[PDB]
Structure 1
Amino acid sequence: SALPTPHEIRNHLDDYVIGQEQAKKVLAVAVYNHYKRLRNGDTSNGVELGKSNILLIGPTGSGKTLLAETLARLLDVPFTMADATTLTEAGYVGEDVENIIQKLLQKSDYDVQKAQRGIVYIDEIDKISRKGEGVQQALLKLIEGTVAAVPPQGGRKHPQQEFLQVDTSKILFICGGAFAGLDKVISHRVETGSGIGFGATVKAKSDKASEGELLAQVEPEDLIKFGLIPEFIGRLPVVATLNELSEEALIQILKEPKNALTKQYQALFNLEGVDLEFRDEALDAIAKKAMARKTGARGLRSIVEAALLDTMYDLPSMEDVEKVVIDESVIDGQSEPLLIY
């Protein structure tokens, strides 16, 4: 079962994710390598190939979790996630870091092979920085290999009497997070250090590309100013930045993806015998509403659902209707989708 080449991984990733072209290549080879090594224990020498962790620094609702999830789906391996803000040091009431290993094994269905080839996804790495440090010290070891006692509970209470130990030196730790403020830190290092004044540059021109291009110039020093301890940065060699979803992106996301919201509603209406259409004018307006309320990609469902709620309540109780054309006025609530039969 020859691993999928980087190109294949990218071409497919595009289908379910529009944009983030640079991060796609980064997360393509990084996984192609992380598995090309695991399938070849030896190296025709005495070398012991290591692990390269990935640090996904992107903005909110950009597709950080989606990329990690969709990448695991291309292959057949376990996928887990977590939240750095739900962890604390030892000796305190706060949930211990070892707990993450438990959740990982559960998804693995009580297996080591699978869990060894798993892709955990820590999140919200930001906000636990300096002035926090203690929680970052424990994770600093797990990410670079550590055997951990897995409490024997689950399938047949985990018969193994050795607490089913697992080596944490083969798990790809895709630690993400939205570093709010890094853009400013980087600007003070790569451009004029004046943010206030008559000659500064105030970000009010709806320049959504600014954050993306700025983050691309990220360096380890920039992370140090953010708070991240030098050791943690060193454990995460790979870094992939994500751009900010613009109006065009959302429009594409509503139609291009194989699991696009538009197609979903079209599929259910087809089961009833009625067709569904989405005028391009309606789609762009929906996008503008999301940016207005800053709901993001997650809020698209709410908007479209609200506009189709009443419609769904009347379609099964009606006859001769075989086509619907959602117009720009339907979403705002000032019109009702015309039934042309």
Structure 2
Amino acid sequence: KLPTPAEIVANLNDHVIGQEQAKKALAVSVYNHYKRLRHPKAGANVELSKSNILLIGPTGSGKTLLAQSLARKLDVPFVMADATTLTEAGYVGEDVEQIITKLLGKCDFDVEKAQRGIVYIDQIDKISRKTRDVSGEGVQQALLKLIEGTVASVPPQGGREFINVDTTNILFICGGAFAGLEKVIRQRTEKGGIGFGASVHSKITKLFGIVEPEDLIKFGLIPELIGRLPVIATLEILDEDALINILTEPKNALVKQYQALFGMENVELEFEEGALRSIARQAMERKTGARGLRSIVERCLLDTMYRLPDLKGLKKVVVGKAVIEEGREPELVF
């Protein structure tokens, strides 16, 4: 049978912390994706179209991790695409049908399976409008007919007879960090006016949560592509508390990754709660999202990691709060 959307989110929960709405949007679409694919395809039965998703969120919020985490249990062909390598048909670069070639390769060129797969297109915000915009609007236009059902003509599994792939039922998840999108939403929601007769109006998570096509059009996406991404799911910006859970709760938590490296030696690595909050706070100030957690941990551990493989008798190393706030050595337990 099919897993319920709650089971999909439960699996996503082992990897992504926060973004409850983005996890919900992905889980429901994938569940509906499954249902559509087992729906009768002939007779008096209504034809079912698909709802594609656009993921809008800040750097290091978990967009790509959601897609990668989702992929672990999809049971349909899944591919990670990259919009920065796409160009118009007549130019250097990859054409939009290259995506289908990659999805098709993932299932050993079994087309019937490729047509049931799910495509994640990363960096969708990088092909916005803001001559011939070969790598920008030209790609958005080329994708219009790939996202909506067409028949892609892609090379065979050998060297360059081409394969006809019906993309009608391929689910597309697009996303990116629309960095300039908050200013547009603020301009629309806080217009106001200047001068007497006119009235003057009051002045990331909140703004993205209210995004509308008008903003994406002014940002630089074309209306024809926006309407083909009917579901807009947003990711918030991680705060100090979310960044603490990301250090220890996930299946591949940052702390767990270092404990494993120290575990290839015979030394146990422990962080104090004061350190975890200090790390999360410092990382938050770097404005790189969760990624900033790695810089802090690499920083505080650099000198103990240098010595560790040469030290003999060490059993446990403790990273206290002081080791994050001040240039202190971690306590070494022999």
Q: TM-score range by the shorter chain?
A: 0.7 to 0.9
Q: Residue by residue, what CA displacement relative to the aligned partner does 1:84-109 show, whole Å, maximum 9, x if unpaired?
A: 23222222234322222222222333
Distance (whole Å) between structure 2 residues aligned to residue 287 and residue 126 of structure 1: 28
| 1:56-95 → structure 2 map (5 Å cutoff) | 56-95=55-94
Distance (whole Å) between structure 1 residues aligned to residue 187 and residue 79 of structure 2: 37
Alignment equivalent of 2:141, drawn from 137, 141, 150: 137
Amino acid at match of 1:218: V
**Deviating more after overlay: 136-145 vs 290-299:** 290-299
**Backbone CA RMSD of aligned residues:** 2.6
- Partner secondary structure for residue 269 of structure 1: helix
Give the aligned partner of residue 35 of structure 2. Answer: 36
Determine whether 1:307 maps to 2:306: no
Per-residue deviation, 1:136: 1.4
8 Å contact kept, 2:58–2:289 = no
Distance (whole Å) between structure 1 residues aligned to residue 55 and residue 315 of structure 2: 46
- Partner secondary structure for residue 331 of structure 2: coil
Per-residue deviation, 1:193: 3.6
Give the aligned partner of residue 235 of structure 1. Answer: 228
Go from structure 1 to structure 2 and tell me whether the alpha carbon gap of 1:327 and 1:84 turns closer, same or farther (over 3 Å shift): same
Per-residue deviation, 1:303: 2.8
Per-residue deviation, 1:43: 7.3
Go from structure 1 to structure 2 and tell me whether the alpha carbon gap of 1:335 and 1:31 turns closer, same or farther (over 3 Å shift): same
Structure 2, unpaired ranges of 5+: 131-135, 195-199
Determine whether 1:246 maps to 2:239: yes
Go from structure 1 to structure 2 and tell me whether the alpha carbon gap of 1:93 and 1:258 turns closer, same or farther (over 3 Å shift): closer
Give the aligned partner of residue 197 of structure 2. Answer: none
**Deviating more after overlay: 24-33 vs 117-126:** 117-126
**Deviating more after overlay: 18-27 vs 78-87:** 78-87
Give the aligned partner of residue 152 of structure 2. Answer: 148
Distance (whole Å) between structure 1 residues aligned to residue 101 and residue 42 of structure 2: 31
Structure 1, unpaired ranges of 5+: 203-210
Distance (whole Å) between structure 1 residues aligned to residue 87 and residue 41 of structure 2: 38
Per-residue deviation, 1:44: 7.3
8 Å contact kept, 1:53–1:235 = yes
Distance (whole Å) between structure 1 residues aligned to residue 326 and residue 116 of structure 2: 49
Alignment equivalent of 2:215, drawn from 204, 222, 234: 222
Amino acid at match of 2:307: D
Amino acid at match of 1:73: R
Q: Residue by residue, what CA displacement relative to the aligned partner does 1:180-212 show, whole Å, maximum 9, x if unpaired?
A: 2322222233345479xxx8877xxxxxxxx11
Q: Residue by residue, what CA displacement relative to the aligned partner does 1:276-313 show, whole Å, maximum 9, x if unpaired?
A: 21112212222233233333322422332343333234
Q: Following superposition, which runs of at least 4 residues in structure 1 exceed 6 angstroms of deviation?
A: 199-202
| 1:157-236 → structure 2 map (5 Å cutoff) | 162-193=161-192, 211-236=204-229
Amino acid at match of 1:170: N
Aligned length: 324
Q: Residue by residue, what CA displacement relative to the aligned partner does 1:135-177 show, whole Å, maximum 9, x if unpaired?
A: 21110110011111221245xx59xxx4232111121110112
Distance (whole Å) between structure 2 residues aligned to residue 21 and residue 293 of structure 1: 24
Structure (1/2) with the larger strand percentage: 2
Go from structure 1 to structure 2 and tell me whether the alpha carbon gap of 1:333 and 1:150 turns closer, same or farther (over 3 Å shift): farther
Distance (whole Å) between structure 1 residues aligned to residue 214 and residue 63 of structure 2: 23
- Partner secondary structure for residue 325 of structure 1: strand
TM-score with structure 1 length normalisation?
0.85
Amino acid at match of 2:151: V
**Deviating more after overlay: 300-309 vs 229-238:** 300-309
**How much identity, in percent, do the aligned residues show?**
71
Distance (whole Å) between structure 2 residues aligned to residue 174 and residue 271 of structure 1: 38
**Deviating more after overlay: 225-234 vs 121-130:** 121-130
Give the aligned partner of residue 208 of structure 1. Answer: none
TM-score with structure 2 length normalisation?
0.87
Distance (whole Å) between structure 1 residues aligned to residue 187 and residue 307 of structure 2: 57
Q: Residue by residue, what CA displacement relative to the aligned partner does 1:57-108 show, whole Å, maximum 9, x if unpaired?
A: 1112111111111111133333322332322222223432222222222233
Per-residue deviation, 1:12: 2.4
